[PDB]
Design a protein around this ligand. Structure first.
Ligand SMILES: [Ca+2]
Length: 635
């Protein structure tokens, strides 16, 4: 009972079907029918719909006479986008000085600006269960030791912390509501079950979850759109299991509106783990995250752009590396090694955290026009690092630093005689106590630091040769979203935000302006304008933008969004965000992208006034402390 047809009665590929049949069914017929009825009661349209295209409002023009919404598929907006993209081709990636790019702070041209804001590629590359978690090369014993020690350091101390859940997100199953009031009542009821709920999920007994809440905890694969360079080919798998070599990026005539030269959006696959399964794990994970990012903030955290540059000049030489398929090559052997290394949690907590990583998947269609869906009753499979797991940002920070700390063990700078001493020399490296080596890591983004340039080249040569992970030099020289700029070889190095990203998140956005995910779109575009005024490439790029903005809309960049601020405040029931002068940069970046707290800043770094308006639910530290004990996780 592993494969469950749901909508179009799809037929998987043989290599996939014969493998799924050999896998034992995750749920018995009692819980399966109870769950199938729940994924049909809810997700009615989402399960029976075809991909088609997107309905996104990209620009809202406020005039004395009227207000016009320009969508991504509007013909007048596509002619503006085509002309602005052509007018921005005069810019090219600038030269890189010893310690950063110079001249115009451009790490890439405005090429992605040809991406059609409403059309995504077909087929949207979908995950494949039997080919996930592949490491390729063997995992060394010294690396698995460093990975266990890095995880032990990260989850060494637990201090109950405030857990906020996005009010724009669903709860999945069993309970399915965006309501903030229902989300907390649903968690209080889960506390009353406590060990009975945790033991059922830790044993793969999804019948208990269906007895009291009507369904079983499943993970829903969601979509996250992205812009793409022209001529980029995407290879992957089909939602039936077939293999796609070159995902079609062409724009159909109904959507191109005659505007040639455009290509389609890349649609990445995300995961939406059940709120019932993720939240109890989040109540413990959040308690250790705010400690790890504070004790060892020299590696995994930051307070402002001036902390990165200061750590750079403390050692002298740096490089920038990105991990190729970091979440895809996340083997299950590495996950359990990190889970088993966590001190303070019971064996019930370890088995509970494993089941959250690999919940049964409800696969939906990606082929354009083909409406179909099925439920993979899979409990024991290598899932990689699903983006919905509460510990995705923390396991990424652990594995990334453990792979570079293993490179120093191969290099010989870190020689180990015991676990207790290796844990100590790792703590010193993380706190940047070593005078010769350090690093700044944020998952798949790592900047190794060294006092001698030849020491850094040897260290980077080692991690590139690793076969269990692909580390490649970042050609863009961006860390997080920070461009490293150096005016002249004599001037100091300054960090700037990429100006290409400003126009990306303004004219080719993922979600509509003033929508549920972007309630402060006008004010958010104003902050990007004022922030990037000091950017070296601000005068040249905005002279081009304002020229094309006036030619098609009769309003400049700042005029367009300052006038829309009056419309924004009215649409949000007079709710006025506090002026950015009183907010920190963490709150600033959280206003632009609400999904910043999940990858960059902490929940305690956001101002409480702004944090309450976006995140309605909030589990207090005393409620999390009661939960982690009631569920039976803490020893
Ligand atoms: Ca980078």
């Amino acid at each position: 009972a592993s494969f469950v047809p749901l909508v179009g009665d799809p037929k998987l590929e043989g290599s996939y079907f014969s493998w799924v049949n050999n896998q034992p069914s995750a749920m018995d017929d009692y819980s399966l029918v109870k769950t199938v009825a729940a994924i049909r009661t809810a997700f009615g349209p989402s399960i029976n719909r075809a991909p088609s295209f997107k309905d996104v409002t990209q620009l809202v023009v406020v005039t004395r006479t009227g207000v016009k919404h320009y969508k991504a598929n509007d013909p007048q907006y596509l002619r503006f986008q085509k002309e602005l993209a052509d007018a921005l081709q005069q810019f090219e990636p600038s030269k890189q000085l010893t310690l950063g790019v110079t001249g115009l702070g451009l790490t890439r041209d405005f090429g992605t600006m040809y991406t059609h804001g409403a059309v995504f590629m077909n087929p949207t590359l979908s995950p494949r269960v039997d080919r996930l978690g592949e490491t390729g090369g063997e995992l060394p014993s010294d690396y698995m030791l460093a990975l266990s020690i890095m995880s032990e350091i990260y989850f060494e101390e637990f201090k109950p912390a405030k857990v906020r859940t996005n009010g724009k997100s669903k709860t999945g199953l069993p309970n399915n509501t965006k309501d903030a009031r229902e989300k907390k009542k649903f968690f209080m009821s889960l506390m009353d079950h406590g060990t009975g709920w945790s033991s059922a999920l830790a044993k793969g007994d999804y019948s208990y979850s269906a007895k009291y809440y009507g369904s079983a905890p499943i993970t829903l694969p969601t979509y996250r759109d992205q812009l793409e360079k022209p001529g980029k080919k995407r290879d992957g798998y089909d939602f039936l299991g077939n293999a796609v070599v070159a995902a079609d990026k062409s724009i159909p005539s109904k959507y191109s509106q005659g505007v040639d030269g455009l290509h389609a959006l890349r649609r990445r696959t995300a995961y939406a783990v059940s709120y019932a399964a993720a939240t109890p794990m989040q109540c413990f994970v959040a308690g250790c995250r705010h400690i790890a990012l504070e004790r060892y903030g020299e590696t995994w955290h930051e307070h402002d752009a001036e902390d990165i540059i200061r750590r750079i000049y403390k050692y002298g030489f740096y490089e920038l590396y990105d991990a190729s398929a970091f979440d895809t090559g996340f083997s299950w052997k590495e996950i359990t090694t990190m889970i088993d290394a966590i001190p303070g949690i019971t064996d019930l907590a370890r088995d509970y955290m494993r089941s959250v990583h690999r919940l049964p998947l409800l696969i939906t269609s990606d082929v354009r026009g083909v409406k179909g869906a099925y439920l993979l009753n899979m409990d024991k499979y290598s899932p990689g690092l699903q983006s919905g797991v509460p510990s995705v940002s923390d396991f990424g920070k652990i594995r990334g630093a453990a792979q570079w700390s293993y490179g120093l063990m191969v290099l010989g700078a870190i020689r180990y005689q015991s676990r207790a001493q290796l844990k100590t020399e790792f703590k010193t490296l993380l706190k940047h106590g070593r005078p010769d080596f350090a690093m700044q890591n944020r998952g798949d983004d790592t900047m190794p630091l060294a006092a001698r340039q030849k020491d850094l080249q040897k260290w980077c040569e080692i991690v590139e040769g690793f076969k269990f992970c692909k580390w490649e030099k970042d050609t863009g020289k961006k860390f997080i979203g920070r461009v490293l700029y150096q005016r002249t070889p004599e001037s100091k190095v300054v960090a700037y935000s990429d100006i290409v990203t400003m126009l990306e998140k303004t004219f080719i956005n993922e979600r509509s302006m003033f929508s549920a995910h972007r309630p402060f779109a006008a004010t958010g575009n104003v902050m990007r304008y004022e922030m990037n005024m000091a950017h070296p490439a601000f005068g040249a790029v905005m002279d081009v933008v304002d020229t094309i903005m006036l030619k098609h809309f009769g309003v400049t960049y700042k005029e367009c969004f300052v006038g829309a601020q009056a419309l924004e405040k009215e649409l949000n029931n007079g709710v006025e965000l506090p002026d950015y002068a009183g907010l920190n940069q963490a709150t600033r970046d959280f206003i632009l992208d609400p999904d910043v707290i999940h990858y960059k800043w902490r929940e305690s770094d956001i101002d409480p006034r702004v944090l309450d308006m976006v995140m309605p639910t909030s589990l207090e530290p005393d409620l999390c402390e009661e939960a982690v004990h009631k569920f039976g996780f803490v020893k």
